[PDB]
Amino acid sequence: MLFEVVKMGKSAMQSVVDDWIESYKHDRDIALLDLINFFIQCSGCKGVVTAEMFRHMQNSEIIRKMTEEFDEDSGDYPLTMAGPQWKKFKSSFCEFIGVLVRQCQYSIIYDEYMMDTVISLLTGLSDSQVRAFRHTSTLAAMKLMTALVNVALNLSINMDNTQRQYEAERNKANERLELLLQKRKELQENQDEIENMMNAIFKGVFVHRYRDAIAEIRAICIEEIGIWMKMYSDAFLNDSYLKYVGWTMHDKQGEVRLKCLTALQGLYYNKELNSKLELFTSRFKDRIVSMTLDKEYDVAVQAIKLLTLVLQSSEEVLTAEDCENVYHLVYSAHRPVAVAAGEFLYKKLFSQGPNANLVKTLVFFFLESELHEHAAYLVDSMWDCATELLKDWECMNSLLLEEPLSALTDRQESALIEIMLCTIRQAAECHPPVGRGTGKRVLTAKEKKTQLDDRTKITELFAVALPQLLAKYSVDAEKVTNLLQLPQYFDLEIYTTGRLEKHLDALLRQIRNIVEKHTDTDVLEACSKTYHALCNEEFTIFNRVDISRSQLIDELADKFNRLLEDFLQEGEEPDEDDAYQVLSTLKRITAFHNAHDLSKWDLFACNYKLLKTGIENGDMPEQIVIHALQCTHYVILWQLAKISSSTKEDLLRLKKQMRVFCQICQHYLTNVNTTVKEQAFTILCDILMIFSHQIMSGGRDMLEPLVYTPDSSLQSELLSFILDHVFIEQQEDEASKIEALHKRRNLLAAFCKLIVYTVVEMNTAADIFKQYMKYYNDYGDIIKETMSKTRQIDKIQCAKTLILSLQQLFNEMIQENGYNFDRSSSTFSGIKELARRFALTFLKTREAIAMLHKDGIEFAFKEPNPQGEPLNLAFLDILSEFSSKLLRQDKRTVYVYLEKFMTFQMSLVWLPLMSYRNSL
Amino acid sequence: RKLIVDSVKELDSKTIRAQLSDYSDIVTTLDLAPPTKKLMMWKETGGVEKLFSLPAQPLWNNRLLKLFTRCLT
């Protein structure tokens, strides 16, 4: 009756032990027998122990019997089972044993008959090959041992208090201290009986299952040895105990390496005169430092967190390379490691203003550890540590403007701005950067106030100071780009509120100053997105900026036009620097057309005239054509944005533009320039999407006249680009190739945008499906995404392209082998494995698999042997992999369609055909 | 009998001396977060979900993006 009480019992634990000890006091044996059966039944053992057993049967014999009458139904025991109604068990079971000892702590755990019995039974189960017995009994044995330590701790105290009772009675009758020294002796004996039991469980259980084979039983025993060393630190914080943690730090299971660090953490947060720890650190410091890159990350966090507790305790033990290694972790991808890395950095290196010293330190640190070209992740690593320092924007602002008191280098300047922007962004939008934040965590009501407070503090402070900074560093393009991001996070309501309109004028006059001076494509993209942020309909200054906006583009178009009439003349041959001129103002326009309605300038003429030259004479700078196609593309999308009240005529005029531009990019996609095809192909795959069947998919039935569908020519010219420039054979380390792949992936994404979406015929997707097991890492994720969406469009015609991919990897073989090739070579075996992975795409998956065989069979004989008894027979040990998923009724269905070509003589060099039929 | 019986209970003296001498299979290298500014953008606009639902040529103004996102289911 006791077992179910601990499982389904919401009754208090001390009540169960006391009602149990009442049964013990009444008759010891009937109480012990159910305490044993409690343990036997805590392991899930559905057997029972009798009275004749406990009278005569030995402990090894009783464990043997309970394994016979175990009567299990599965391999699960309680401690393995899942659900909260079982972790209430792990807790109730542990609290039962600790409470049991502590209540017996006085006068019963000394009868030398009960504790003796339990340990002997627990020490026995703790050696059974039966995992449920060893696991249960070992958890018990350890919880019982902690109890004994607690009991042993009270014997220590109570014995010190008597020694104080004694000497006071010596300094102040003798029969009162002779009554005391016998008390002291009785306590001495009681400690010896307790020490024995601890030894009987340590040497009996711990020294064996600490290195058990089951990982869950090693994590049990390290957690408890960490508790002993913590709670009776005087008696148990030796090396003869710490060793069993220093070794287990090397265990190959993660759950264990954690339960060592967290146990060791208990020993340093106390930080109460650690002196034995000084030796244990000496030997294992190198391992703990290594663990900050443990393969399991929970361990890595606790390894870092532990090293901070080692820093506070001594600071003398960590060399230089050790600390420097932990610093680099602030750039890690796992945020928990990063934030705890930066806790170790702040604690180690941070202790014109008070923070002026600190901000220089951060800057220098960011510059010294060249792992990151930018501070976005550096800032998030320490957003939790030093939040009042990262938001002291006055301190950074003065350090960039206020000249020295008693300097600063161009590199530290171009670093302090980077750190300043990142803090500003993470302040304004209250979430960490990509690859660090867990999800779209909703903002706390306290956080929304902390978010709107500094958002204004940023807008108020920098609206004045931003134009000054943009005036002192106007020349370094790398700097201004960072400094033309600050408006994105402004609260534009505060420019009108409070005499500040003067400062926006100083800003706009400073912005158009740098766009007159720079040509860098990244500066103008930020100038453009600035103007697009300040031209907002909600706010009180749309007008004051739209002036400068249209006022600036006037100065642009007036130039650009004049530059064309001289650059596109028949007589004069323009030159290198005359081309620099047209490119500069072209870039200046292109980047503005992307974020600003500039159809009010109708730039289609000058670009259409420019493009016509480049394809005609074939001698135009790549950067002009690239920026031409762009600027063009941006005029067609802007006109299309304004279309019924809007003049219902000029519709076909926009189609002529779209139609002739599509023909322009067709001749430019064929160019020898690699970059020029990239932008031509990109604009095509985006154009063909917009002017497509879907332009009226939802509403807008009126925008139906605009009708484009790609040529059979423009389709094969687009796919041939995917083959030559995305599926290549397999500059600056790994930071560049990932940039390259992420470009090549964006391209294969834009073409597979067309396939799913019926912009091109689906049979094109066969030259891409055949690569699914070749470029699984590189482009695999896109293939199995385009392939599974095509199956959900046309279930059957997919099977007709899946095989076309297999058909095209078959003549891809013979093209550079010959028809006599080995039909088992790892080359063939892969196509055979590609078939197995293809048939697993299959509910309506019946009419498709039929026509797939038919297109496979009708191809396997599609050419007869010009000399012999055939050709393409091998394609059937490939196709055999599809017959598994075929229906039991189609064994018939397709075999006669097979017998449409297999004669009676063939079913009499031919292995491929005999395996195909053998699948039916 | 589905009862889990372990044929080997303990780990032997030798295979613990090996664990202490070669922790190389439980440590690793640093998984750097995007190192470059652009590598952060292409991590946000990577994967199939954001790739299939965004243009190739980036569109900065929202009204231009809508034309591309109007034509998607």
């Binding site: 090396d239 003869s240 710490l242 060793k243 220093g246 070794w247 030796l279 244990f280 000496s282 030997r283 294992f284 | 003296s13 613990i16 001396r17 202490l20």
Partner: peptide
């Protein structure tokens, strides 16, 4: 740091 060193057994 001899207690830490594993025994031969």
């Amino acid at each position: 740091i001899d207690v830490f060193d594993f025994p031969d057994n």
